[PDB]
Amino acid sequence: SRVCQVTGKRPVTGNNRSHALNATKRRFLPNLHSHRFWVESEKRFVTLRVSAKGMRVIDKKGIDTVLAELRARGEKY
């Protein structure tokens, strides 16, 4: 599914609104990218499907802290 493994961002629903205010249902998808993250503690690459936002979280917190959070949830990688 289109779910960020770091943040849990997923598709949300809302409306397209025309100039005449016609509402049609749409989705907003996360900006997801499969990315190979270097885990220097483990000396290997871990691939995560992450939002661009999730990538900024990894930059801020570090991959070790993030993977520990994933292990606590039971999110496997």
Partner RNA sequence: UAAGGUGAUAUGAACCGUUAUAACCGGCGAUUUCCGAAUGGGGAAACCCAGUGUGUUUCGACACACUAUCAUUAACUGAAUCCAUAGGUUAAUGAGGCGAACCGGGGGAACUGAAACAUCUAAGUACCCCGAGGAAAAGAAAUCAACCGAGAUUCCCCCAGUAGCGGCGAGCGAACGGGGAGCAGCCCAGAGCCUGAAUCAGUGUGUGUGUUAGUGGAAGCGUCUGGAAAGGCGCGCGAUACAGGGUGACAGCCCCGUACACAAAAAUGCACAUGCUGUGAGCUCGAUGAGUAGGGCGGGACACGUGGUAUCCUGUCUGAAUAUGGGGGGACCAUCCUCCAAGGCUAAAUACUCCUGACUGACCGAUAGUGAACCAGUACCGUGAGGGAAAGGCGAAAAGAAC
Partner RNA sequence: CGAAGGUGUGCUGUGAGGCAUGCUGGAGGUAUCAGAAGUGCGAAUGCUGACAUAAGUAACGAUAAAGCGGGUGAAAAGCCCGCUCGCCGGAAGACCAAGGGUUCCUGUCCAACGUUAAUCGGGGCAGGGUGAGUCGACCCCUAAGGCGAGGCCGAAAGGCGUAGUCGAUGGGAAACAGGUUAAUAUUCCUGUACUUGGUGUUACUGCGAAGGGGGGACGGAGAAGGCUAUGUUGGCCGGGCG
Partner RNA sequence: UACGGUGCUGAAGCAACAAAUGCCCUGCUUCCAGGAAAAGCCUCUAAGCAUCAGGUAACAUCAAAUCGUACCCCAAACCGA
Kindly state the smallest distance separating residue 62's Cβ from RNA, in Å. 10
Task: For the chain, give percent helix, strand, coil, nearest 5.
Answer: 25, 35, 35
- The reply on whether position 28 binds RNA by CB under 7 A is yes
∠ CA(44), CA(46), CA(34), 5° rounding?
140
- The reply on whether position 29 binds RNA by CB under 7 A is yes
Residues that bind RNA (CB under 7 A): 1-4, 7, 9-17, 20-23, 25, 28-31, 34, 49, 51-53, 56-57, 59-61, 74, 76
